[PDB]
């Protein structure tokens with residue numbers, strides 16, 4: 001594959017130092033490059049077969065093809081002895097949700113504004129490049145040593161670039177072509193499907209304000225129904241938060257998809273008019 | 289591949305009798321099975337490499353996976369000596385546009401109603417199965433010996449089944465999931481993109497009424513702009529046609545995609561309340 005190395009042992013290049021996490025696709029390791037000492041998160045995924053490699057390729061391609069300050073970069077990928085190894089630039093601060101559980105408190109508003117401003121830069125880049133993240137949450141937002149964030153986990157992301165390029169491809173005179181296809185207003189080019197990330201952004205903000213996401217107290221079987229039935233969630237103790245926080249949430253957490261703001265529109269919102277990460281440097285300093 | 293035979297010579301099974309057509313992907317042959325005498329259209333596509341096979345796989349999969357009276361079936365596919373052979377059930381009457389050029393006249397209204405009624409059955413089936421044809425025109429509607437039609441050419445079709453199945457796939461509790469994703473109102477499940485076939489249906493009807501499609505007289509470079517700028521096309525000599533023909537066209541040829549009818553809705557329209565192919569049997573009898 002374009003970005004996956006064959007026939008070489010990943011541990012002749014990368015040394016495992018310890019375990020970072022552990023989830024549904026196995027354990028994630030802290031790796032260190034044996035030549036350069038560069039640190040990595042190493043995902044090691046058991047594959048029963050080779051056809052399974054196709055299930056992980058969109059993620060690899062997104063990581064390898066993205067070049068943004070607030071998206072994690074691909075350092076290496078190996079297929080060796082029935083495992084896919086994915087090495088990702090290391091974010092020394094860990095995930096936002098892991099910090100809140102360690103400090104046993106939510107983020108402050110000024111801290112949320114920084115994460116939000118940078119997270120939004122990442123999403124805007126993704127959407128501009130026809131990528132939908134599809135699993136935005138506090139656990140997939142990582143803190144760097146310098147108090148910045150990077151967005152991670154493209155395991156269920158969609159990349160519409162090849163399908164856009166394929167569908168625009170025609171030959172001969174297209175007398176029969178629908179005007180929305182003529183006008184490049186097919187679903188691949190309209191905001192509609194990308195706006196699902198905007199809603200998840202809103203939920204992540206409440207998750208950062210309150211440690212846990214809305215409906216965390218329900219039987220998990222009820223959560224999808226609850227989202228369907230309910231008005232959009234709001235902050236539980238609204239006096240604690242600014243009008244700008246509350247107003248930003250309402251542009252995100254809007255069930256009418258046409259009325260929900262794009263990442264482009266949200267970048268002009270005063271809640272993200274910040275340019276210093278000092279509140280996050282203070283937070284990650286207390287966690288270190 | 290799931291539906292493509294390797295290592296066997298297609299001409300040890302199928303005998304070429306002659307040429308049917310000739311287009312951008314080469315010549316199409318009239319083939320005859322050497323054991324059974326069953327007739328086929330044989331597409332023979334030059335491939336420079338094996339990676340190119342992926343470009344033709346969605347089409348093969350659609351043909352192999354569809355089971356409808358008014359869609360052409362896959363009889364065989366072979367990869368041999370750098371060519372992909374695709375064998376498709378033979379429609380002895382040829383394409384609708386080829387008949388109009390042979391007889392040098394358009395279809396009558398009663399003939400259009402039959403083609404339309406059957407073409408619509410095919411599309412409804414496709415859309416129900418998450419397939420967009422994407423190249424509906426009179427040249428891709430074939431007449432059978434019995435006066436029925438079959439829809440062909442899935443060379444640029446979209447099949448959203450695997451991508452729908454992939455995107456519904458989640459694990460753990462989805463607190464962050466947008467309500468339109470909860471409610472299965474993503475673009476894969478909404479009518480929006482499938483309605484592009486409905487518009488092409490409308491143009492094909494005018495093409496059958498008038499031999500050539502709207503704007504056939506323009507410089508080909510102008511046609512896309514003309515579709516963009518213009519109100520939807522209408523029949524050139526409207527006194528020749530029934531109110532039901534004209535009204536059916538307006539439900540199809542509607543620029544507001546939300547207001548354009550689905551194939552489901554169009555099946556209830558009186559223009560397609562027909563159940564005899566006798567007008568088409570009369571037409572194909574004159575062409576034989």
Ligand SMILES: Nc1nc(Nc2ccc(S(N)(=O)=O)cc2)nn1C(=S)Nc1c(F)cccc1F
Pocket residue numbers: 019020021028040041043072088089090091092093094095098139140141142152153
């Ligand atoms: N790029 C990256 N850096 C890190 N650093 C990290 C992770 C956990 C911890 S820990 N165990 O919380 O102290 C510390 C640093 N994790 N990480 C990734 S990609 N983690 C991660 C993730 F965020 C989501 C899914 C799978 C993963 F492996």
Ligand SMILES: Nc1nc(Nc2ccc(S(N)(=O)=O)cc2)nn1C(=S)Nc1c(F)cccc1F
Pocket residue numbers: 307308309316328329331360376377378379380381382383386427428429430440441
């Ligand atoms: N299934 C099928 N049957 C036929 N029959 C046919 C075609 C041409 C003629 S001819 N040359 O007009 O008399 C007669 C019968 N053609 N055909 C197909 S799939 N034709 C065709 C097509 F309709 C669109 C694209 C490529 C194709 F090869």
Ligand SMILES: [Cl-]
Pocket residue numbers: 020021022028
């Ligand atoms: Cl982790």
Ligand SMILES: [Cl-]
Pocket residue numbers: 308309310316
């Ligand atoms: Cl042909």
